DNA sequence: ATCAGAATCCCGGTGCCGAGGCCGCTCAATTGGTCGTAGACAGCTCTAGCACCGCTTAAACGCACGTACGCGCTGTCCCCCGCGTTTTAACCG
DNA sequence: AAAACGCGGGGGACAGCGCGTACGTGCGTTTAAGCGGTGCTAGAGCTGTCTACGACCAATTGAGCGGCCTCGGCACCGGGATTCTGAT
């Protein structure tokens, strides 16, 4: 597997297959699929650890809306990177 | 009554609280309607003009997601 | 039926990064459509460069760029950084 | 929790469609999409209108206050 | 906490015009007041100077401000008419008979001892009043209460020292002791006159329950089901000695009837009616459990299946024997919630009541079979082999009996059909419900019906004369209705009518109201207690109500109507055995008038499809 | 109520640069044909989200009451206008 | 041609003080609405057959692009008429 020889936990070659067939470009080089795997993984885990730590803070051992949407907002770089976005049941700041 | 009325002026009450608002007038709440009413008719728009492209006789999350999406707010939760 | 969604991968960071806690079928959604999202970004914004750069192919350092457009900044040098030690060690292999 | 109210929402939103199509039938997943966005641009707006009013010296908004969000917001 | 003014019962003239005016009503008139955290029997004449700043006096001026409009309208008003007045005092009576009773009490929960201001400790009796739940229970002085009611005290210490308390029920799980064929009534029932039927039944049940599976009453419904339910509760408490909590869960407008029931086929078993607001279910824990650190008193604890979901959990932890359901119909959907619940309920043994069985579709059967037995159970040819081998195997599970072959003194019941025609303006609204621009199948129904169920229909056919016009001929379903309400009359037959809509009822109602005939409606959003005093009314012996306004299933699944004759049915529900388990309402052994049943069919519609098909569920049955 | 004093404004004069036309021959257009395969169409099984009704009860409506704040008015005094004058950075060959 | 300093000066900021409409706050009603439960049956969502549609490829040519070249038209000026503005 790309992803399991890649040690990034985001499936290359199924993003390889989507910029495909996204009419994205004719072809598509080897690299970007696996940077862009790379960058989602980085993504998905810096706000699943501040969605952890929210848990933890409200004491809690499962991540809910409230988690997500307050590490979001709380955090002033994924605040500025998600301004103009709403998630779904979640509270306010 | 009719149901632009159906958003009760509690319910008006409790959004402006979540927004940090300590009194609101009674002028608000019709107006209130009123924005809710129109951010409607938009959204409701789009959605319905995505249903009648894809021959599919129901409004669809995504396609209200999409809606959303290009008004400029995306929604995350009915994704697929 | 195959369904089109970021579940195990999703899975498989957070118990990387939180082994104890999980995410339940919502959340899941949550975190499958908002990397659908920037996925989605990411990838607009390295087709769209490689048109105005009147280049018909895609690769990491469109992604490069599209990233570095895209997240606001500090966490710009981060996403660059993991994405350049996955693309090099791609090249490799 | 959800606070726009659930039944009065679905037949706004069902009344609404109806002048843009008839037999035009919804989603449960659709409707809730629908609240959700329409909360949470109602409290980014009354948010907008309290600052307003706490610019103007007043603790409570005014229809002045929500058309100043409005109209710089753009959608006016 | 603090007294003040709570509910308010009734006025007077302290001493011997059309509006009184406030000073007018403060002076001369005096009203009898009831105060908070107080018996209802504590009532008190009282006047503003005297009663002073309190609270509560927004509900003396609400009731005073009724009791003004009240005498500007009985007969002070312009309009004066003899129906007019004869409503008024009737519901005036009728509320002063309710409150009446309403001091009277009907139970005792407790005794405690509390020092007063001179130091007693006198005794004190916390006691449920009649047509309460046991929310809003007091603490009523000892000596008051056995004066009142020394019957109850006494049933009451009977209770508290019982030799039938579950604490030493006997544990036969082990091994079920094999019973005796009974052939006459156990001297236990003190009801008496139980039928041979019914013997029939609780011994059947009685050699299910000993072998240890679990069955199905399916006897139709008007057989004394609920009374083999009851007798075979008290034979499991005092034949077995297995005196541990049993619950009873029934649909709601039929909770009062099993306590009829349960009281007067078993006195000195005890029943704990289990419904009420939240205060309710707490008074409810209060006396259900002791204050330590577990044993149950309660022998029998009724329900309905709402509240089976609300305290599902709480509920979930009491050991119970003997669970029954009342008409198993709603546990026909393994998916339902009640399913879930009742499956999850931690119960020894369960059965189940329904007047019909086998519901629209093979699946309700199997479900049903499933949950009384939990892992225990196409082509034409093959399927006629294999109904008749499931069926064969569930008849020694099932017991079934049929009102024709028993019970002769049950006269015939007779159904008929009449087709009736679509007025003009119902099939306009049918033609412009095929189309758009007038301004679902059940758009069709609604119009074939009566057309003042749609939101404008009203001026599109329009005094008194007009209104009364209109609304008969506006349908021919109407019109039948008039020539058959009218006949009726002549014969001074009673009749009860079952409608799908709420808003068909309300349409009857404002006729009925119109034209001048006393009725009574019971429906789904009637109040408990109001539902009662409706059942109690047309079922006395003097009535002057000749309709009943019925929905199909809130009056039509387990409610007892004695005293009626006819029984029209504006539409099938689209299950033929929903519509007879209403229609069995009027047929129940105490009936000696041969009813017969006239169900109103609109020709060239959806009805006759809809029948057409219940015609195939009606083949199912064999 | 009045007319003087700055700014705005009307016309038309001369100069310059870009608009719009023309010309050639570049490049992609436009037939003409072929092949593969994406969609239209037809048909089936099965989902799911109507329409309403129970039932309890949280929530909304109406009304009444008290008082914190909206809006107005007045007063003082900081903080800009609106020049004139003097630097200053910029102006485009 | 514009920026930068400086002075007097008018206008308006900001604060205070009062009154009264309007607001929030109980008090319980009536309302309606989860959250079950009914029976649909519209219309998916999916598959399979076969056609017209569209993607590529030469071969032919005619619209567009760059270069080149005129001259209307706009910006420009001085001078003359228009104008809205206090000021007393
Ligand atoms: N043997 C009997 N003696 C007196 N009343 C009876 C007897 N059998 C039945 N009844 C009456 O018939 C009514 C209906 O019982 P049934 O329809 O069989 O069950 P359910 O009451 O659950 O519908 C009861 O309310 C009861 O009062
Ligand atoms: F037997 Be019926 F349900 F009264």
Request: with cysteine.
């Amino acid at each position: 597997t790309r992803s399991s020889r890649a040690g990034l936990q985001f499936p290359v070659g199924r993003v390889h297959r989507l910029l495909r067939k996204g009419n994205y470009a004719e072809r598509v080089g080897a690299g970007a699929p696996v940077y862009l795997a790379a960058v989602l993984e980085y993504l998905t885990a810096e706000i699943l650890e501040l969605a952890g730590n929210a848990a933890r803070d409200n004491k809690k051992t499962r991540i809910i809306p409230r988690h997500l949407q307050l590490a979001v907002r709380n955090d002033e770089e994924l605040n500025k990177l998600l301004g103009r976005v709403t998630i779904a049941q979640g509270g306010v700041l | 009554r009719d149901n632009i009325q159906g958003i009760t002026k509690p319910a008006i009450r409790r959004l402006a609280r979540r927004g940090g608002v300590k009194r609101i007038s009674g002028l608000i709440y019709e107006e209130t309607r009123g924005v809710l009413k129109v951010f409607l008719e938009n959204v409701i728009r789009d959605a319905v003009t995505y249903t009648e492209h894809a021959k599919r006789k129901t409004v669809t999350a995504m396609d209200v997601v999409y809606a959303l999406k290009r008004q400029g707010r995306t929604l995350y939760g009915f994704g697929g | 039926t195959r369904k089109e969604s970021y579940a195990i991968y999703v899975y498989k960071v957070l118990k990387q990064v939180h082994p104890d806690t999980g995410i339940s079928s919502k959340a899941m959604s949550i975190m499958n459509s908002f990397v659908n999202d920037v996925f989605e970004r990411i990838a607009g914004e390295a087709s769209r460069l490689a048109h105005y750069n009147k280049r018909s192919t895609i690769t990491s350092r469109e992604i490069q760029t599209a990233v570095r457009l895209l997240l606001p900044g500090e966490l710009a040098k981060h996403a660059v950084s993991e994405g350049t030690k996955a693309v090099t060690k791609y090249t490799s292999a | 929790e959800l606070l726009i109210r659930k039944l009065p929402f679905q037949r706004l939103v069902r009344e609404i469609a109806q002048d843009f199509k008839t037999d035009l039938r919804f989603q449960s997943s659709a409707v809730m999409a629908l609240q959700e966005a329409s909360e949470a641009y109602l409290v980014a707006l009354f948010e907008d209108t309290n600052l307003c009013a706490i610019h103007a010296k007043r603790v409570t908004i005014m229809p002045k206050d929500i058309q100043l969000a409005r109209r710089i917001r753009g959608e006016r | 906490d603090f007294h003040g003014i709570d509910i308010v019962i009734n006025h007077r003239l302290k001493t011997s015009k059309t509006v009184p005016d406030l000073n007018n009503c403060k002076e001369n008139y005096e009203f009898l007041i009831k105060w908070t955290d107080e018996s209802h029997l504590h009532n008190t004449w009282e006047t503003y100077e005297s009663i002073g700043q309190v609270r509560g006096l927004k509900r003396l001026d609400n009731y005073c401000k009724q009791f003004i409009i009240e005498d500007q309208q009985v007969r002070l008003d312009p309009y004066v008419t003899a129906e007019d007045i004869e409503i008024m005092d009737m519901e005036r009576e009728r509320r002063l008979d309710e409150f009446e009773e309403f001091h009277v009490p009907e139970r005792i929960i407790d005794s405690q001892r509390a020092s007063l201001e001179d130091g007693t400790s006198q005794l004190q009796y916390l006691v449920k009043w009649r047509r309460l739940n046991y929310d809003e229970a007091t603490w009523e002085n000892a000596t008051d209460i056995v004066k009142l009611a020394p019957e109850q005290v006494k049933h009451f210490q009977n209770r508290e020292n019982s030799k039938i308390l579950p604490q030493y029920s006997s544990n036969y799980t082990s091994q079920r002791p094999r019973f005796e064929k009974l052939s006459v009534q156990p001297p236990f029932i003190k009801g008496g006159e139980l039928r041979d039927f019914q013997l029939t039944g609780i011994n059947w049940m009685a050699f299910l329950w000993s072998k240890g599976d679990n069955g199905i009453l399916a006897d139709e419904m008007g057989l004394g089901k609920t009374v083999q339910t009851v007798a075979f509760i008290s034979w499991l408490i005092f034949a077995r000695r297995q005196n541990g909590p049993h619950i009873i869960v029934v649909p709601l407008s039929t909770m009062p009837a099993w306590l009829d029931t349960f009281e007067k086929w078993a006195p000195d078993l005890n029943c704990i009616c289990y419904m009420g607001n939240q205060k309710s279910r707490d008074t409810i824990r209060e006396y259900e459990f002791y204050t330590n650190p577990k044993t149950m008193k309660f022998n029998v604890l009724l329900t309905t299946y709402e509240y089976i979901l609300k305290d599902r959990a709480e509920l979930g932890s009491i050991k119970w024997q003997f669970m029954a359901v009342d008409e198993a119909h709603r546990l026909k959907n393994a998916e339902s919630s009640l399913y879930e619940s009742l499956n999850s309920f931690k119960v020894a043994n369960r059965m189940l009541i329904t007047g019909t069985p086998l519901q629209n579709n093979i699946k309700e059967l199997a479900a049903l079979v499933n949950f009384l037995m939990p892992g225990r159970f196409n082509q034409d040819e093959e399927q006629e082999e294999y109904i008749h081998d499931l069926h064969r195997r569930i008849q020694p599970f099932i017991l079934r009996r049929l009102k024709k072959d028993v019970e002769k003194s049950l006269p015939s019941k007779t159904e008929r059909i009449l087709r009736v025609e679509l007025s003009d303006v119902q099939t306009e609204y049918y033609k412009n419900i095929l189309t758009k621009n007038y301004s679902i199948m059940n758009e069709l129904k609604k119009a074939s019906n009566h057309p003042y169920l749609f939101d404008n229909a009203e001026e599109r056919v329009l005094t008194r004369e007009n209104v009364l016009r209109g609304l008969i001929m506006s349908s021919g379903k109407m019109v039948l209705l008039d020539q058959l309400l009218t006949r009726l009359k002549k014969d001074g037959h009673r009749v009860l009518i079952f409608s799908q809509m709420v808003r068909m009822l309300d349409i009857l109602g404002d006729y009925l109201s119109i034209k001048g005939i006393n009725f009574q409606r019971l429906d789904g959003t009637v109040p408990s207690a109001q539902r009662r005093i409706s059942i109690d009314h047309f079922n006395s012996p003097d009535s002057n109500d000749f309709v009943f306004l019925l929905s199909t299933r809130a009056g039509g699944l387990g409610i007892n109507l004695m005293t009626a004759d006819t029984v029209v049915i504006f539409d099938s529900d689209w299950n033929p055995q929903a519509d007879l388990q209403a229609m069995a309402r009027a047929h129940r052994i105490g009936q000696k008038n041969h009813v017969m049943v006239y169900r109103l069919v609109s020709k060239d519609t959806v009805e006759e499809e809809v029948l057409e098909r219940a015609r195939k569920k009606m083949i199912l049955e064999y």
